[PDB]
């Protein structure tokens, strides 16, 4: 029968680096070709509407750095770097669920040797290197964006609450006290094998247990959505987002940041680019860092109280 095989099996000692360099140059050229999407064949841009939404971005959680404001308080911001972010395809309204349109957005770039055949065919037909994960954002109809455009981290501006969701750090099969937070029996008070036992689970008259009973098992290996994350600083050169609070997940992982749907922040994106921030048609160069009117800039000459 057919045995297992990979890409560097039937290659000599002078062909593996050649193939690596060739595929590296190929993916670099493919990434550089999709740099100016506005000069090609862009879709018509529609004005901003109060009853519409937009597409989010995909970032990578670097680390967590402290941050101070002007009033003297100390906050905490999380670094979200956007390496490569593009649009895969576009699904119409009458093809998904008949409610809202969707957009396929991929994460960072990877290799073409550890992917499925259909994935490679799709990324070859589209013209972009394969990605790690694929996310879907629910948008409206007038926010239709042509697939194949670069998405930078400058799409968000300091002064907007966003929502970041990712896969949390899994704890595996753990006990119930560390999972659900149940109290435990005393220690050396004559206890005989019951320091971390839940005890009862149900009653004697029902003859069974309820499915909604908190019992030990796997916990942490799931995606959690975080709400109320205000941005305080937007970077342009390195494309770093400074979201306040914590991001559910570990370090060096792909997240999914988008606009918030809370009722307190309904129509607050009128001063924001509804389609996508294009560095070609803006006719202006944004600064390296975009600060807020409340965060203490590093170049401050020692703020003093009066």
């Amino acid at each position: 029968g057919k045995s297992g095989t990979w890409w560097d099996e039937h290659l000599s000692e002078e062909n593996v680096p050649f193939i690596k360099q060739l595929v590296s140059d190929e993916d670099k050229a493919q990434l550089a070709s999709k740099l100016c999407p506005l000069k090609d064949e862009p879709w018509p841009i529609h004005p901003w509407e109060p009853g519409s939404f937009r597409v989010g971005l995909i970032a990578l959680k670097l680390g967590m750095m402290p941050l101070w404001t002007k009033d003297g308080q100390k906050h905490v911001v999380t670094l979200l770097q956007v390496q490569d972010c593009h649009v895969l395809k576009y699904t119409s309204k009458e093809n998904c669920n008949g409610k809202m349109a969707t957009l396929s957005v991929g994460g960072k770039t990877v290799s073409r040797f550890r992917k499925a055949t259909s994935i490679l065919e799709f990324y070859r037909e589209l013209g972009l290197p394969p990605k790690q994960t694929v996310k879907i954002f629910n948008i409206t109809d007038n926010a239709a964006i042509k697939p194949g455009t670069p998405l930078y981290a400058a799409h968000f501006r300091p002064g907007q609450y966003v929502d970041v969701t990712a896969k949390t750090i899994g704890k595996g099969f753990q006990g119930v006290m560390k999972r659900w937070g149940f109290k435990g029996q005393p220690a050396t008070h004559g206890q005989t094998k019951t320091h971390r036992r839940p005890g009862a689970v149900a009653t004697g008259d029902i003859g069974r247990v309820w499915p909604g009973t908190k019992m030990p098992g796997k916990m942490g290996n799931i995606y959690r959505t975080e709400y109320g994350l205000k941005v305080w600083r937007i970077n342009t050169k390195h494309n770093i987002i400074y979201v306040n609070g914590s991001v559910p997940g570990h370090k060096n992982c792909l997240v999914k940041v988008k606009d918030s749907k809370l009722p307190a922040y309904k129509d607050l994106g009128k001063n924001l680019p509804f389609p996508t921030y294009f560095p070609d048609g803006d006719e202006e160069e944004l600064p390296e860092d975009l600060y807020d009117e409340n965060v203490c800039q590093p170049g401050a000459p020692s703020i003093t109280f009066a």
Binding site: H10, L11, E13, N15, F18, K171
Partner: protein, 152 residues
């Protein structure tokens, strides 16, 4: 939960583990070839790399001398390590101690492996040599490379 933590436990604690690793390192310095489980030979190679580095850093240093006297319980291996294995890798940095995997043992059927230093007066182990540069795929790759070189 053991995230980002190595240090594979073997004996009855850290002291026994360090003693076993020191014995394995002494045996590897002496015989230059030892068959043992994959974790044991991996830790032995990881410690032997730093041992070779410290022996190459110098001889008159008291720190390296104390480390060699501690990690070698045979005494006679210290001059050998300082006057043979140190001048040998004077042109190399951290590229040595090649690890090769063997099948299993005829006793309890455990995964083992054999490591050794470079050079080695003993005959070399049968290295998994790759395919020759004359097969169909290799010839096609060479032709494509020559074509892209002549077209550039």
């Amino acid at each position: 939960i053991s995230h980002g933590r190595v240090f594979r436990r073997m004996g009855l604690g850290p002291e026994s583990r360090i003693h076993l690793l020191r014995n394995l390192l002494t045996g590897l310095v002496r015989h230059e070839r030892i068959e043992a489980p994959w974790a044991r030979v991996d830790e032995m190679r990881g410690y032997a790399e730093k041992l070779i580095d410290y022996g190459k850093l110098g001889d008159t240093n008291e720190r390296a001398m104390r480390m060699a006297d501690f990690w070698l319980t045979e005494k006679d291996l210290i001059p050998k390590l300082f006057q043979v294995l140190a001048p040998r890798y004077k042109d190399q940095t951290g590229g040595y101690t090649r690890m090769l995997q063997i099948p299993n043992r005829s006793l309890d059927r455990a995964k083992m492996a054999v490591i050794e230093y470079k050079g080695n007066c003993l005959p070399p182990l049968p290295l998994p040599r790759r395919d020759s540069h004359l097969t169909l795929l290799n010839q096609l790759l060479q032709g494509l490379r020559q074509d892209l070189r002549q077209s550039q």
